[PDB]
Amino acid sequence: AIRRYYLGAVELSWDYRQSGALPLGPSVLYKKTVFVEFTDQLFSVARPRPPWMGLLGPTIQAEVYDTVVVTLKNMASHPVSLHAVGVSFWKSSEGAEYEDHTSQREKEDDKVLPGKSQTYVWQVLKENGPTASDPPCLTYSYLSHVDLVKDLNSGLIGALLVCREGSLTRERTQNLHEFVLLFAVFDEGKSWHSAARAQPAMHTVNGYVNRSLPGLIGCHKKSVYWHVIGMGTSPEVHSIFLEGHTFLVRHHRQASLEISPLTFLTAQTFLMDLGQFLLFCHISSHHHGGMEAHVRVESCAEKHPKTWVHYIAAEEEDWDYAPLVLAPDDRSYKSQYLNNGPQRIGRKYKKVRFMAYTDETFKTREAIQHESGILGPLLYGEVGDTLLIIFKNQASRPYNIYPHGITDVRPLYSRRLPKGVKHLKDFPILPGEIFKYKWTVTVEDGPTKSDPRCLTRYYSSFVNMERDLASGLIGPLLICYKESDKRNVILFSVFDENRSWYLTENIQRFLPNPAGVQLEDPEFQASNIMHSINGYVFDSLQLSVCLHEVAYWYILSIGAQTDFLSVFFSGYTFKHKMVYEDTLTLFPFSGETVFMSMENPGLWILGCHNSDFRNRGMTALLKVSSCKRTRHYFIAAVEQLWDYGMSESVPRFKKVVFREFADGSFTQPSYRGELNKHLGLLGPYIRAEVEDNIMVTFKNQASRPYSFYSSLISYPDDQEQGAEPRHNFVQPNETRTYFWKVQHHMAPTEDEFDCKAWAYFSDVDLEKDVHSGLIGPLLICRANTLNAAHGRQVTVQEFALFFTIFDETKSWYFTENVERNLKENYRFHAINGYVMDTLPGLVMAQNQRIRWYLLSMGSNENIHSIHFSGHVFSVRKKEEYKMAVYNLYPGVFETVEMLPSKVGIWRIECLIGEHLQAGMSTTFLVYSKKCQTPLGMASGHIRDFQITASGQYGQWAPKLARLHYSGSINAWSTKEPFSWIKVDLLAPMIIHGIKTQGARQKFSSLYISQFIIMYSLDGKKWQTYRGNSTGTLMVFFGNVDSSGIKHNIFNPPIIARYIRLHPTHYSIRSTLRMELMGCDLNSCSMPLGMESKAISDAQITASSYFTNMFATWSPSKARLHLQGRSNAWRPQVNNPKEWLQVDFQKTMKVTGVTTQGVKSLLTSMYVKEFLISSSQDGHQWTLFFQNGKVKVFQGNQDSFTPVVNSLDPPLLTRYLRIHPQSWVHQIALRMEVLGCEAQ
Amino acid sequence: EVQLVESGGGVVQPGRSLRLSCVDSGLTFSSYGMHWVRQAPGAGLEWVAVISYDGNDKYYADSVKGRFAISRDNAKNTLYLQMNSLTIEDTAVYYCAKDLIESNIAEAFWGQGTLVTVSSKGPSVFPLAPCSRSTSESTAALGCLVKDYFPEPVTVSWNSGALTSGVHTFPAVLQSSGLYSLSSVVTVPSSSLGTATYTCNVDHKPSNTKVDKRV
Amino acid sequence: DIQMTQSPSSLSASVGDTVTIACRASRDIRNDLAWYQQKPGKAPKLLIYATSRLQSGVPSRFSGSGSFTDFTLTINSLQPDDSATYYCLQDSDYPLTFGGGTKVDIKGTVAAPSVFIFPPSDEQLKSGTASVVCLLNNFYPREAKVQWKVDNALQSGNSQESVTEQDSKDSTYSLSSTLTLSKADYEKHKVYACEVTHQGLSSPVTKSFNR
Ligand SMILES: *[C@@H]1O[C@H](CO)[C@@H](O[C@@H]2O[C@H](CO)[C@@H](O)[C@H](O)[C@H]2NC(C)=O)[C@H](O)[C@H]1NC(C)=O
Ligand SMILES: *[C@@H]1O[C@H](CO)[C@@H](O[C@@H]2O[C@H](CO)[C@@H](O)[C@H](O)[C@H]2NC(C)=O)[C@H](O)[C@H]1NC(C)=O
Secondary structure, three states: OOEEEEEEEEEOOOOOOOOOOOOOOOOOOOOOEEOOOOOOOOOOOOOOOOOOOOOOOOOOEEEOOOEEEEEEEEOOOOOOOOOOOOOOOOOOOOOOOOOOOOOOOOOOOOOOOOOOOOOOOEEOOOOOOOOOOOOOOOOEEEOOOOOHHHHHHHOOOEEEEEEOOOOOOOOOOOOOOOOOEOOEEEOOOOOOOOOOOOOOOEEEEOOEOOOOOOOOEEOOOEOOOOOEEEOOOOOOOOOOOOOOOOOOEOOEOOOOOOOOOOEEOOOOOOEOOOOOOOOOOOOOOOOOOOOOOOOEEOOOOOOOOOOOOOOOOOOOOOOOOOOOOOOOOOOOOHHHOOOOOOOOOOOOOOOOOOOOOOOOOOOOOOOOOOOOOOOOOOEOOOOOOOOOOOOOOOOOOOOOOOOOOOOOOOOOOOOOOOOOOOOOOOOOOOOOOOOOOOOOOOHHHOOOOOOOOEOOOOEEOOOOHHHHHHHOOEEOEOOEOOOOOOOOOOOEOOEOOOOOOOHHHHHHHHOOOHHHOOOOOHHHHHHHOEOOEOOOOOOOOOOOOOOOOOOOEOOOOOOOOOOOEEOOOOOOOOEOOOOEOOOOEEOOOOOOOEOOOOOOOOOOOOOOOOOOOOOOOOOOOOOOOOOOOOOOOOEEEEEEEOOOOOOOOOOOOEEEEEEEOOOOOOOOOOOOOHHHOOOOOOOOOOEEOOOOOOOEEOOOOOOOOOOOOOOOOOOOOOOOOOOOOOOOOOOOOOOOEEOOOOOHHHOOOOOOOOOEOOEEOOOOOHHHHHOOOOOEEOEEOOOOOOOOOOOOOOOOOOOEEOOOOOOOOOOOOOOOOOOOOOOHHHOOOOOOOOOOOOOOOOOEOOOOOEEEEEOOOOOHHHOOOOOEOOOOEEOOOOOOOOOOOOOOOOOOOOEEEEOOOOOOOOOEOOOOHHHHOOOOOOOOOEOOOOOOEOOOOOOOOOOOOOOOOOOOOOOOOHHHOOOOOOOOOOOOOOOOOOOOEEEEOOOOOEEEEEEOOOEEEOOEEEOOOEEEEEEEOOOOOOEEOOOOOOOOOOOEEOOOOOOOOOOOOOOOOEEOOEEEEEEEEOOOOOOOOOEEEEEOOOOOOOOOOOOOOOOOHHHOOOOOOOOOOOOOOOHHHOEOOOOOOOOOEOOOOOOOOOOOOOOOOOOOOOOOOEEEOOOOOOOOOOOOOEEEEEEOOOOOOOOOOOOOOOOOOOOOOOOOOOEEOOOOOOOOOOEEEEEEOOOOOOOOEEEOOOOOOOO | OOOOEEOOOOOOOOOOOOOOOEEOOOOOOOOOOOOOOOOOOOOOOOOOOOOOOOOOOOOOOOOOOOOOOOOOOOOOEOOOOOOOOOHHHHOOOOOOOOOOOOOOOOOOOOOOOOOOOOOOOOOOOOOOOOOHHHHOOOOOOOOOOOOOOOOOOOOOOOOOOOOOOOOOOOOOOOEOOOOEOOOOOOOOOHHHHOOOOOOOOOOOOOOOOOOOOOO | OEEOOOEOOOOOOOOOOOOEEEOOOOOOOOOOEEOEEEOOOOOOEEOOEOOOEOOOOOOOOEEEEEEOOEEEEEEOOOOOOOOOEOOOEEOOOOOEEOOOOOOOOOOOOOOOOEOOOOOOOHHHHHHOOOOOOOOOEOOOOOOOOOOOOOOOOOOOOOOOOOOOOOOOOOOOOOOOOOOOOOHHHHHHOOOOOOOOOOOOOOOOOOOOOOO
């Protein structure tokens, strides 16, 4: 099914309200950009634009094994292009070139002359599409990336749909009809027209603002399959949520209301309700974010009660939120706010709260029990049950309650209330009145023949959140049977007292003379709101469990918190979704079933570990209490004073990161390379499986003492006679082994991925020292597949990557950057350590299963959707599945498996502006091993003076060291033991193999016994080949005799255009016989199976040939490097008209063609002038016409040396031929097939 | 490096032939380690020219000596000298040597050899005391007639009333045509000569000499 | 086509001198030629490496140089050890010719030759052979051929020359010449006389004795 689908891009002047650059007031006026498409080929006749279209994403639904073509027409002023996600293409629109400085390979991207189509021709196949067990239809997206500032001012995102067919058989007629949800961000400050500022940044959804956005529909209870996609490329965020229904998949019930600032989710919604649905934002100012929408109605189509009645009450309870005082200790500037001043009120705050109370005495305030306040009541009920809750408000100000998740509520007695209110939203509650709510659970509480053991739901009030959060109204809901008593679940309730009414009474209750605050200062409003964790801090919350009980762990949270929170319990690894992980972030409205086992106690000081909290002196201590030879591992730390650069960025930056070492003394670091590029400016890469401890004797040399934290310290109750804490703070020159035993339960099922990845950090200074650079990852596997001592496994290649923010203020080294011998300098962005598109080293096998460990930590602005461009990665959930949805999350780290069938350079995406503006591209390269060819020196393409060395002597040249050359001078003699010869490759191509031979002088068979290859890229960053494992230093064995030729391959290839070889071990004399063997990343210089003489002779055609009675000199007979009588090719006569046609059956770009002479009769032949043609239909003739005379190259030095007509520039069209003009004695040409089958 | 030791015999006798060889201890040789040469003072290297050059060829300009058949190959150097006809042509200070290739201690070790002469008829000694009139010639040339002594290891004894020193040396006199020249002449007073006759105490039982006294 | 000779063959001069020996080549050759030092009774051993780089540890007396066709061996310390045979030899395959050998001769003291007459022994008569040795005392130079006349006929070439060290006190050499002659000519003349002819003697003297 060929899809003729076209696209266009234009700019409009519209405000999306109907039906010199200064703000104007009501609805203002601006210019907004939108895509417009013409289905027909008239470009002038367009179907009318509906008032509900706006910026709604143009979908492109596709089918497997079907070709799709997309075009675009330029109606703007600047060139743009389209960028794809997860689709294999051929770089025609990638938009990010590299260090070539060559002619127009793909330099048409930012070049769009008026018009042009520039079709892409995508291809979907079995690997490109879903499988049977995969979801019925997945989703993609597309966005331009060639233009940075224009896209940040346009934000014109598109959507894609790719999956199998199914519209041919009997399918439900609910698919397509063009429904999709997107989000956008508006700004035009740096537009082409462009215009102190007074211009804020706002967002728009589906291209409609202020009520002009329809789309909210209700219909029958049909399983509609609609996905929601969204992305953010700008700083700051906004609250967005949905009310209608939760996201339910298959037979596992998930009630997740996952509506995040950024979301790429493939799921469906269930449209059970008939009516209106609402999206709300947590912003007080209604002018900002006014996307309220009314209802548009259309039709999509045409377990027993038992007595569980309990009493629920409400009463106030005053609590001192800081029972412990630590004011005298003024060690870390903490006591600046502890001294009375403009805004010091105190700690006694009174407000009516909600919690259970068994009895109904109500004479005075009695003191309830410790650790059981501030929490809400537990509620247990059944389907269709009756239950009465007594509700009361101490203050005259009305509070109200409204259940969540419960839809079946009918008016009492009468269907319509005669009063002036016809809904349950505003029902007055007298301070002491009695009122109940009729609830009835739906029928999907118990599925067919599978009554669930237990499930997770929870409710609260959803009527007066602008005020409910000021009063702390939360109620737990336990809903299931025996398969509890201890109820001390941690909660986040931040006290918003500015909205609380009792503050206005506190004003005179606490301050007799408020003349010094004026009550109009915003700083008191900002300070008044204090952060609390379940109402108890300063060593006041505890918990304790043990083994062999029928009970599960439960943890809940309510509140969006305006940011992200990171809380967890070190030491105990909870099971979240059958995956074992330590550090889980806190996202609002989430609830799961979990159980944690009590295995090891241990007291270590720690906090809530948030970026901005834990500063108040909160510990939240758990205190669970009770009811073969190993591999030496070392971690070091050193500072490298290395500024990143001066051109395209004295100031100097020293960074200290975790390393790996060999022994206690700082003599040998065991420096490695290739496969262990992971270090960079990151931590070390540790391979460990089981039973081997890490006796890391961490000790710094550096210049100042600091500390190291394993993040998995597993010790028994050591330090007896009192549980004193760990001092840590490793000073230089000390011995302290941090060593712990890996656990067997931290290894997944064999059918699952066998190796799991975690990380470690330093707990003392996350933002002072860890953000200075000391962050280190770790890796733990299971079983034993890394056999032998060093593990030549060649199954999976393993790297990892990390994101963070580096600032100069975080480092300690501000004032001494002078070597101690406007304000743009304040804004630095950390990308793996190095910037300016020059971080290579991610080399990987072309065709093999490869496992990756995504990792990312740090602040808020260091997590975002990142994936390798143009690939397909997925994770197996106990079955074969294929989904490419996995992004960066704090702490949540898992393993992914993928294999790229294609080759070439790719690019790391950047979906955040502040980092794409830094100039980040940590690209990677992949090779093909099949290449075997000398790459410039054995055949003498290189020039003379481009090779230089120390000293030169008459009648001695080392260049003669080419292959199969001997006789007199075949080396260069020098008394000094070692030597160095530098040859440049003129380009950074791939290097695979190295070969050598021995020479003969006098009566000796000279050679080189052993040597090592070393290389670099610019002569200032020297590094050698330290791959293949099997020992840190390996010695390369040389030849054993004069005629010894061998073949060897480097498993990690060498990436360099320069190379210097240092023969340390030499045979008597400084023998110099070097032969470089190489290739390019294309790998398109091999015969296409034509070596087989069994191939058909009718597959090769021509104009004419040697035709006579003895016509056996066929053109295909003249094959390169074949022994035989008269084995050459001669035309019918001495005419230039004869060509050498070949079987094409596809369009190809020429790379190189070789031609040889014939070895018969011993006569030299050579060719001076010739020509090369090109045709597509046998009519036209267009070639590489340059600078007057067509580019001509001269070859055929003798009758025997072959020459390859490597045609770098594109000689297009489906016909390449040659015509020999110059000739000696008689025409006799020998040829060979070259190239590949691709594109 | 590698030491060279000879394994064979050097005494020639017409009627039979033997085999000559030289063997190293470690085969750190190549396929071109073959040459032969001996001593010729103030002359060539055989007597006017070298035995062979050209690496592995027995030929210089004429008279191709292909008769020098080579047994075994590669890491061993050997060639047989025809003792049936060359005879005096095969008498010199032999060396087993080859130009080494590592050149780090000594480029060319050398053999030692020994004094070699042709096998003549039976020798003997028979001196007669020169008359007083002969001594009255104002000189006294006393030389013990040492010529082709058998066995080769022999010691010259001097007894004339005074033990001279430094005249009983071992000079490397060049070989004559089937004879080795050797003579020790020392000036002694006439009075000491007449005390007793000087007798060359060669280790030869059947030798007999009479004493003639003249006054 | 390499044909080289060696010049000179003998020399003697004063002290504190500095001379150079060279060999004429045929055409273009390399600097790597051979130089073995052989004193009278020592195995010829090389002292200069490749004639291009002086070997470490070798004394400063020997210093070789030269390339292409010319070669120069410079001496820096003079000793009477001048008795040493050199050989200009090239390392190559094509037909080459080396030097002739430079064996110097030792000078002595001018003295009147001492007459000596050793009568033939009776063992020569009783054994049927003829071995008459008539050694001359105080003779100079080494080019001194003992003359035997039969019927006023000269006999030249029949006497070999011996080359050895000059005696410190006697200044004589080891001369052992044995005239291989038939018994018929030996017994034809009853009395053989050994006459001494040099510049200081005019007429031979022949006197009889008892056999
Ligand atoms: C009614 O319409 C106009 C647009 O025609 C709204 O103006 C913008 O509304 C967005 C909504 O998020 C704000 O972010 C912008 O700041 C508004 N622009 C200006 C100049 O105020 C207008 O606010 C809408 N009215 C309400 C109450 O939202
Ligand atoms: C041992 O401790 C010292 C300081 O406590 C570390 O620093 C060394 O200090 C000495 C003192 O004179 C210097 O001589 C060394 O040069 C210093 N070392 C370095 C690397 O500069 C020292 O590093 C510690 N030893 C080890 C092995 O860590």
